[PDB]
Symmetry: C3
């Protein structure tokens, strides 16, 4: 009975893993399904949420933070396994305000970063809504 190859039909094993480099055995249909399902990256669609970028390790997070009277903790939807790498954010308003959205990246932790809404000339402002986007791993 012939052995299966690229050029000749024959008998073959069917392997049910994604870490075999055997060029001469078939992948199972089940592992095709596992691979397809992996495109549905782990995520949360919450107001403040996250999405894992495949198996790269990178995680994008986002949310709406409400400022307080000091530069205070913005708590990530998902703790970063390693670190926040970068973050950006903007005022959410229906009035023409110029507010400094300032992040203390130098003291960020795996779970939070100090975030504030600065007034021109003055100190931190409370009650400002800030939409932010971050990446880390």
């Amino acid at each position: 009975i012939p052995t299966a190859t690229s050029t000749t039909a024959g008998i073959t094993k069917v392997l049910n893993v994604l870490n075999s480099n055997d060029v001469g055995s078939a992948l199972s249909a089940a592992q095709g399904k596992v691979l397809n399902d992996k495109f549905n990256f782990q995520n949360s669609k919450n107001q403040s949420g996250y999405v894992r970028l495949g198996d790269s390790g990178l995680i994008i997070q986002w949310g709406v933070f409400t400022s307080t009277k000091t530069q205070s903790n913005l708590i990530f939807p998902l703790a970063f396994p390693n670190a926040l790498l970068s973050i950006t954010g903007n005022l959410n308003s229906n009035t023409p305000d110029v507010i400094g959205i300032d992040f203390d990246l130098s003291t960020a932790t795996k779970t939070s970063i100090k975030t504030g809404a600065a007034q021109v000339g003055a100190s931190w402002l409370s009650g400002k809504k800030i939409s932010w986007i971050a990446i880390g791993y």
Copy 2:
């Protein structure tokens, strides 16, 4: 004639779908191609464009918006099926201007968000270019 398994070469079905959990039949080469092609996530490379993050549902969008004399509609390259979740943006300039890039997230729709360029002390400014990045689903 032996039946194919992980340990014994034999005869097998070849399944041409990505939603079978059959561990004992082969996936077709054709579905390997479908899976490979799925890494080319749906997207637009336009100045204002988007990219779908696999099958997670999340969509990143970006663009260059030109401000008007009021906080006015920034129209997303792709309508969000559900909602915009977060957005950020910056002035594009070659002069040292401080302008408040302000988004009315509270009244965003699936197709647009009111966006303006605020002057310190005064109202909305027209003709300012704003590069933005958003995520939603």
Copy 3:
């Protein structure tokens, strides 16, 4: 000896490529591994780094830029093969400063973009840390 199909077990070829649309031959286990490994998108976890969004062509980059006395070059971690499409960024501080994070997108190149930290009323400020996020291809 029966030929493998979706409905009948039989003999089959085993193909070791990801660009065959043959519905009647098996994909190799090895190509299942290649596909799985493709979820680990090419990236750098450096302070200023990047991640490729699968095979879509889109690349997200991020970093921490230090401003100088003029609007000066922010050098991307990875040269864009085509162009930067959008960029955002924020001051990193522990003090309530309002600084204009301004990008000259109109003169960006594949390798850099002129970036500055503007003072209200005055010119560019040196020594300001800016965390940024970009997308392009």
